[PDB]
C-alpha cells in the first residue's frame with residue numbers, strides 16, 4: 647500500500663566508448679581532415695550545442711529518448727574519438743556522424759527547431775565531405 651514507486655529513478659545510459667586498447671586504429675589523411683576540417687567547422691557553429699555531448703535525457707526531460715534511440719551518438723564523442731585516434735578509417739567516423747543526424751531525424755518531427763539545426767549542420771557536413779582528400 648505505502649510503496650508509491652517514487653524510486654528507483656531513471657538515468658542516462660553509459661555514454662559511447664572513446665577508448666578501446668584492443669580496437670584496431672590508424673591515422674590517415676582522411677581522418678586528420680575529419681578532425682581539422684569537418685569536426686572543427688561543425689563544433690564552432692551556433693547550432694552545434696545540442697550535439698556537443700551525449701544526450702542528457704534527465705536534464706532535458708526527454709524520458710523517451712533512450713527508449714527510441716538505441717545507438718546514441720554525438721559530436722563530443724566523435725571529437726574525443728578523433729583526438730584519441732580511435733578510428734581505423736574515415737568510414738567509421740563518417741558513420742558516427744550519420745548516426746547522430748539520423749537519430750535526430752528519428753526522434754523529432756520535420757520542422758522542429760532541433761531538426762532545422764541538424765539539417766543545417768548536415769548540409770555543412772556534406773559540403774566538407776565532398777572535399778575529402780581522395
Ligand SMILES: COc1ccc(Br)cc1S(=O)(=O)Nc1ccc2c(c1)OC(C)(C)C(=O)N2
Nearest residue numbers: 696697701706708749750753754759760763
Ligand atoms: C524545449 O527544448 C528545446 C527546444 C529547442 C531546442 Br533547439 C532545444 C531544446 S532543449 O535542448 O532544451 N531540449 C531538447 C529537446 C529535444 C531534442 C534536443 C534537445 O536535442 C536532441 C539532440 C536530444 C534531440 O534530438 N532533440
